[PDB]
A paper describes a structure:
The first complete archaeal Ub modifier system, including E2 and E3 enzymes, was discovered in 2011 in Candidatus Caldiarchaeum subterraneum. We have shown that CsRpn11 is highly active on its own, cleaving both CsUb precursors and, at a later stage of the ubiquitination cascade, CsUb-conjugated substrate proteins. Our bioinformatic, structural, and biochemical results reveal unique features of the archaeal proteins, but also remarkable conceptual similarities with their eukaryotic counterparts.
We located two protomers in the asymmetric unit, which form a homodimer grossly reminiscent of the Rpn8–Rpn11 heterodimer. However, while the latter is assembled in an antiparallel fashion, the CsRpn11 homodimer is parallel, with an interface formed by the first and the fourth alpha-helix, H1 and H4, of CsRpn11. In the truncated CsRpn11Δ149–202 structure, however, which is lacking H4, and which we solved on the basis of the full-length Rpn11 coordinates, this dimerization is not observed. With a KM of 31.6 µM and a kcat of 4.0 min−1, the full-length version displayed similar reaction parameters, indicating that the CsRpn11 C-terminal helices are indeed not critically required for catalysis.
Numbering used by the authors: -3 to 52, 57 to 148
């Protein structure tokens, strides 16, 4: 359906995304996914961001993400992004589609992890996490990828 067949999100990455998203329920937070492909499987090993957590400048976002990237594993690379949409359920907005298309122009296997962390933050159970991982097909459809 799209360039990447499926995705494996390592627990430390998922933890980082969820902590960010769940710590910031008033905001549609974002960051980068760090990992590597292994054939048709895209591995998400880590996540970084230049955004603030919680209740809160491009110049600060750039510094912070550069600092995080400087500490990242040199055998890994940017494989996508995440975006939280508290209370909106899980889909790519029109804006998100544009962004994802831009990511894919940088790296054809890039993916978009969308999370709605409201229920997780209420229940404190990962099984209440609402998320999907998306890519955009050539013909412009939003495709939801298998995730382990």
């Amino acid at each position: 359906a799209s360039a990447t067949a499926r995705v494996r999100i390592y627990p430390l990455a998922l933890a980082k995304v969820v902590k960010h998203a769940a710590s910031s329920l008033q905001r549609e937070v974002a960051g980068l996914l760090v990992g590597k492909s292994a054939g048709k499987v895209l591995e998400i090993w880590d996540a970084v961001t230049g955004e603030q957590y919680g209740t809160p400048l491009d110049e600060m976002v750039m510094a912070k993400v550069a600092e995080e990237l400087s500490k990242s594993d040199k055998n890994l690379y940017i494989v996508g992004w995440y975006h939280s949409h508290p209370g909106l359920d899980v889909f790519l907005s029109p804006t998100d589609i544009d962004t994802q298309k831009r990511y894919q122009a940088m790296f054809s296997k890039a993916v978009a992890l969308v999370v709605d962390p409201v229920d997780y933050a209420k229940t404190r159970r990962i099984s209440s996490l609402k998320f999907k991982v998306f890519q955009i097909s050539k013909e412009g459809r939003v495709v939801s990828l298998p995730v382990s």
